[PDB]
Ligand binder design. Structure first.
Ligand code: 8EJ
Ligand code: 8EJ
Lengths: 265, 264
């Protein structure tokens, strides 16, 4: 992987592995989301981070994901090479955004796109906050100054408001718990695990007959290592759309909400 | 990745990823086991396999793992390049063996080693069987003819018999279930998931203060996608543990194993 000529974006190629693919011998959406995370980490390292700025470490502030939105046109096959380009943009005092473009390395065609919203939080109190001027000035030298959007379109799916699923859910998967492989290097549940948990409540017949085209997920609260989660899904719809909700098994505290759009194979 | 000069082994380099490491910023043993499977799959593809031979596909026969044994001296750090060499050997009528050597790409030193025993099974009836002369003759042209062992040492840990853990277990993790990410391309639970399940019943304090040095796991029966597993562990001692995975309901054994840990 490497920063592009202008130093304002980063590219990396990945060869899809045997254990990374599903029944169609193409990369799962969780494999894609892990690759997105990996290229994001390599971009941060290349521009001098370790993605907390100098002022952030002083104030015990970190970036956390508020939303992930992914659209896939073609999932890369086992053994194929996929190239991913990523860049960040400041969104004033709201937070930051990281975007990605996925391309087939041989054909050069765009096979997917993704966008994510990140908010600043105090590491210890978990209190969200706006971006201060000092922090915004420190990371703007690593971002394109003019807007550069993976999802330019006027009323595009990436910014749509997601409602809260009402009981009773049409489908459910109960008692989901993370194991050590679901944790990151800081012992927090990896953001991709929540995508897998959301998808668990989609019936296997939909997965066997449809291709996942779009997934939008809001992150509200984290699942701790000793927590237990319930995954709830209700059909809202040639295409099938679902509304999703992850909540703690006990008290029913919301941890995530999302939507998925599937196309008939 | 590529076959070596003689065409009897395969090598591949991997750069350790951010999500592949644990709290020490080094690759987990599940990441290592996934890399071992990946280089094994790339070796099979390079020598013409689908690792089922032409005869195997005709009588609906497949290879299945009976045992996995891994010894790690140093786990590669996040961003490091690790080189893995793999090869297969026939073990007469019993089955086949796949071995691996892990090396740091910069220093060239051996950082780990692994060995696995594979048995032939009918894919439909699930009945185990010996290797016929016909199948054995078809894959011997892809193996070194003289023995080449990752674990040469006489009476070494890789061939030790594992006893069955007796109730009550000292530690347990109950109600473990696979999710879609735990399945392979054929909708079977990935062999590496069982390693993660075994390790789940080791207390977090042992993991925080020790380094996993050796893991030996026997595979007896598969966990189906709708099955639920209990992971049981008892200290037998460095720290050594005896492990057992069984189905939550009837208590049917799916795996047994041992782990050896060194104080950090
Ligand atoms: C592409 C794809 C479809 C379904 C799932 C799942 N976990 O159900 C993951 N990836
Ligand atoms: C190297 C290492 C230690 C512990 C575990 C685990 N899952 O407990 C995995 N990998």
């Amino acid at each position: 992987g490497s920063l592009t000529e202008d130093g304002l974006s980063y590219k990396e190629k990945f060869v899809v592995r045997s254990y990374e693919v599903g029944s169609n011998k193409t990369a799962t959406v969780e494999t894609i989301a892990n690759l997105l995370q990996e290229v994001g980490c390599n971009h941060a390292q290349s521009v001098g981070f370790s993605a907390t700025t100098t002022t952030m470490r002083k104030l015990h502030l970190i970036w956390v994901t508020a939303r992930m939105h992914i659209e896939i046109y073609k999932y890369p096959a086992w053994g194929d090479v996929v190239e991913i380009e990523t860049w960040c943009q400041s969104e004033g005092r709201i937070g930051t955004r990281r975007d990605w473009i996925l391309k087939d390395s041989v054909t050069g065609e765009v096979t997917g796109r993704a966008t994510s919203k990140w908010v600043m939080m105090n590491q210890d109190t978990r209190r969200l906050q706006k971006v201060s001027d000092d922090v915004r000035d420190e990371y703007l030298v690593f971002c394109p100054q003019e807007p550069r959007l993976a999802f330019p379109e006027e009323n595009n799916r990436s910014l749509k408001k997601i409602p809260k699923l009402e009981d009773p859910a049409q489908y459910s998967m109960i008692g989901l718990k993370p194991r050590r492989a679901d944790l990151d290097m800081n012992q927090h549940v990896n953001n991709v695990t929540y995508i897998g948990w959301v998808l668990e409540s989609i019936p296997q017949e939909i997965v066997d007959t449809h291709e996942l085209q779009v997934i939008t997920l809001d992150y509200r609260r984290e699942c701790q290592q000793d927590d237990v989660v319930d995954s709830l899904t209700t059909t809202t719809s040639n295409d099938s759309q679902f509304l999703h909700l992850l909540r703690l098994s006990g008290d029913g505290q919301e941890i995530n909400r999302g939507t998925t759009l599937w196309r008939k194979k």
